[PDB]
Point group: D2
Chain length 341, copies 4
């Protein structure tokens, strides 16, 4: 059908707690690009850190970085035959240039080439009715994967997956996972699938119930900095606020590994005496690469990864974001029904 000249888009402005729905000129696809009519857009906590200030990005942007849609317009170099009408596609969040040094080494999650940015961090995001995508950054969603699970596997599944491959854990590893939410429950599933013994914490009774439901060999209901160390091979702190980071660096093994996978706090402090004497390793992990994306989609098709999404109204995004901050969402949430504006 006909692509419109203007669509509705949630615009962020540096200084406002809420997103403003506005009228955006629908983008015309550049060379090597297409226009996606959004089918499902995942809501992510990082967007609350943006709206709150703790992760600053350019103003006057459309947020949203968990993107799934169909191609409805084609730029130069894209042959319409290559990308058929009706086919569901998922976008590679980081939106890599695909030809720079970070990209060509793998590590295209870390692209910082100057003619693009990460989705929902400047480049027009998922909280709108249409957005651009470079063809190189689109993956065909395998039949049987719903649009909503497909959206959230680009970040809620992808990110802990990339981090856990960093962790090089296996059936003899014993790992700890702090914070069990959108990423967290996927984190449990993928650690369990890699084979590791898993223990999981999260304040929400619902989220611990999901983790016990998902194979977490131990779902703890408490965790104080006087519960002596169980010397895990690997701690994934997926909230990463000073409270949980302190807990993690006490609970990890000598010469162990801690990944602060969350953006709970823009600064973070560690005991240096201990870090040094026990040769602790803290590793940054950011999103995941496009190879990682191909792999996780394979595993979601295989039923190994079974993401836990819920649908919601596009028009309700702001309200939905409110309930995310108060933590009244079971696992992740995804906007659908974009034509209800």
């Amino acid at each position: 059908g006909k692509v419109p000249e203007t669509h509705k888009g949630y615009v962020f402005t540096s200084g406002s707690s809420r997103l403003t729905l506005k009228d955006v000129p629908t983008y015309k696809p550049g060379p090597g690009e297409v226009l996606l009519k959004l089918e499902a857009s995942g809501v992510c906590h990082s967007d609350l850190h943006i709206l709150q200030g703790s992760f600053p990005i350019p103003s006057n942007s459309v947020l949203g970085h968990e993107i799934t849609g169909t191609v409805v317009a084609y730029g130069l170099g894209v042959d319409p035959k290559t990308y058929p009408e009706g086919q569901l596609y998922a976008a590679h969040g980081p939106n890599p240039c695909g030809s720079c040094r970070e990209c060509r080494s793998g590590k295209d999650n870390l692209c910082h080439a100057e003619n693009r940015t990460n989705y929902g961090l400047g480049y027009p995001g998922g909280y709108q009715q249409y957005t651009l995508a470079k063809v190189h950054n689109l993956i065909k969603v395998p039949d049987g994967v719903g649009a909503a699970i497909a959206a959230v596997t680009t970040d809620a599944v992808l990110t802990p997956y990339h981090a856990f491959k960093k962790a090089d854990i296996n059936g003899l590893s014993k790992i700890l996972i702090i914070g069990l939410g959108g990423l967290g429950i996927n984190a449990v599933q993928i650690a369990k699938a890699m084979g590791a013994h898993v223990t999981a914490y999260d304040l929400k009774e619902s989220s611990r119930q999901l983790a016990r439901q998902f194979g977490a060999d131990v779902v703890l209901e408490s965790l104080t900095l006087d519960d002596a160390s169980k010397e895990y091979d690997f701690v994934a702190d997926i909230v990463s606020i000073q409270s949980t980071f302190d807990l993690a660096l006490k609970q990890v093994k000598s010469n162990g590994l801690v990944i602060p996978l969350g953006l709970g706090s823009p600064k973070l402090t560690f005991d240096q005496n201990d870090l040094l004497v026990r040769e602790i390793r803290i590793l940054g992990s950011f999103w995941g690469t496009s190879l990682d994306q191909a792999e996780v989609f394979d595993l979601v098709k295989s039923g190994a990864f079974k993401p836990q999404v819920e649908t919601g109204k596009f028009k309700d995004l702001n309200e939905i974001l409110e309930k995310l901050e108060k933590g009244q969402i079971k696992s992740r949430l995804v906007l659908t029904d974009f034509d209800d504006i």
Copy 2:
């Protein structure tokens, strides 16, 4: 003959000053030997012990850069194998030799309940005699003097361990912050592994020393306003917040930072930035006994030329003050354990 008490320096918990007393000459247990101290290197970690940022139990002797001569044998030790008059160096961490960490090869990380590191509990080097588990001694190659050998076990060994953790070669570009006793050896080690070396210290003679030893670039200034030069590796051998902040701005994306120093007991980083750029922060502590062997090779061969000066045993307290005030050229080491 072996006296029954000897003179030692005891850190008591609560004094910024070690006090010199008579301390009992311990009996060499099984597999142990009693050494008369020949050179005891002076490490800044000892100012951290005294000033209280690093806690060791009290009633303790604090030196941990140890070289000496066998002078009494415990049950199990063949004097043919470990002759009197032979200069040995001690392995500072003092591993047990048998636990999971020791058999891993990570024996710098031994926490076997049988022993503790030298000078963090176990009778360290700031005395006339100490004990050594002879699995933890290494024969000082002829040509290597006691002073340089004593510095080799820490001021060389520790940066050498760290820089092999860092996996750098002739193609790497790195930055070293801090050019004292560890730092100048760190310049030497990184150059021997091939890395292009950038170096910064506040002391001008430390900077010139880094120039002397082949540092490709000596920054005379380094502030947070300077643009990042994107090093593969940054070894911050100061490890206060100032230097850590610089290290995390100046390290390349997905790069490595090792805070090798103990300048501050707590450190904080930019979590947005460590996450987004997937930065690696790794602790690195002392060195392994395999590392010890390797570095004594590299010192014998002249690849490493540890920079030392000698002072009197009796002057330890004065020179430790000189070190806190940054007035030691590189590393100082005590000689003449008889003058008292």
Copy 3:
């Protein structure tokens, strides 16, 4: 009780297919050593390669390198209190010096210091009533581990375990195991425990039945060099004769890993064109380290590793070796009842 002045020992002589039982002066323990009265000695195929020539060692030696016994005499430096009467100990096969560069780096499986050799490869082995052991190379057998399983975990379990840690496989890896025998069935168990998808081959119906019984997700009954490649992450060839090596290098993944874990053939040929273009990796693996030994004994106590041994008569060693060459032994076999000479 009283240690005797002479005991019975199976001596190998370069040139004879059979071991000769002889009268050996019982060894007097050196400094840091003890004398072990053997409780259980595992029989290993490598001993058939020694007897057959394909793995040459000094003549006039006692073979046997899977050793379990009790301490009955103490050398200088060993305090009798430290090593109590009646306690079962297992020996570290490679018999490392424990202070050289190979030893101090881990890798003490690769000790080649000049004042010792591997058990059953020069240094007096397990096919006798008593043998020496350095205290550093003895591990207390945890209560509940029988002497026979304890013997075979020093090599039948240890060796594939060390190799598979080399392989860095996890719940997402898919690996292939050729040859399912003494090592082979332990190999299956430990791959399954590390999490990997496992497919296993062996000519013996009994041994494939054991592998299907032990968790092998696929137990193949055939394998020809025209079964097209299933592109395994990792192939463990535990027979390593040219037949199986060719199979392995075709079946492995691009940039995959092949370990020839067997001594089936002293020479071995590979297609160089393929090895190069697909960046294949062939890795030698030998026995395992003493850290590895501590770990496998932990896991055997934990019931994770459940070795499959059978007892036999010391006096029947030679006959037993005959049935090993014709492959009429289910899994591994261990000599017991040493006082039946």
Copy 4:
């Protein structure tokens, strides 16, 4: 103007000789560009193709060290971005850019059914014009001439890929067997990464060339009777049995051997010895596009000085014979694609 046929060298399956014919000037497809060849390096792998030990489909053009100038644009390619008159180098493996292996970064290992490596099927360099997927072109830095640039994509790139697989630094001690076109660059690369380098070739001028370029030790003789000198790493860039046997005797315990050459299509090792000593044998093929970028940097900066001579296009068959008889000093590269 772009001709509709050009002159090319076709390997036909069954001849030890490539034959020169007219071959159609292919039309640049989507994302592709048609280049006029400016320099085509001559690789010994081509003698292996001709002599039959390495099989490529027939009716093929065999050059794979490719540099040239854009001269026609296919659908999708902006001439502003890829100007005529600009010297590009091609990435020999010619990856698809999008498959699992390409996104891994292991794009030297691409086996996407869309394409194949240059000169093993895809219209290689032994002709006047070829096609390039412009994701697979790299702009030749000014100062770098076509000849050296064409050699940089293979004779430099391949040992550079291999030696980074080998993880060596200023502390490593290695041996290189084979000092032709790959080998002399391999000496340069290992020296740039810091390794102590030992080198052996049969040709004396190859040995002297290795001396020229800083090889620490040039063996004038190497036989199996020689004692093992226990190298961390051995790169056998001959890879016949003779040289492989030497490599596996001379490599240290738990050490690395890479048989980089294609001297023999099958190789055998001592299984007792590979097992007992836990030897690592690793294949290494071409280089990645990240590797390509890095090496063009290192050549521009003068860290790598690839050793080339130029000959006429028309003489390819004569010089390939000269190469089989070991009579090329290092690497030769074809110029003057107009003289015919």
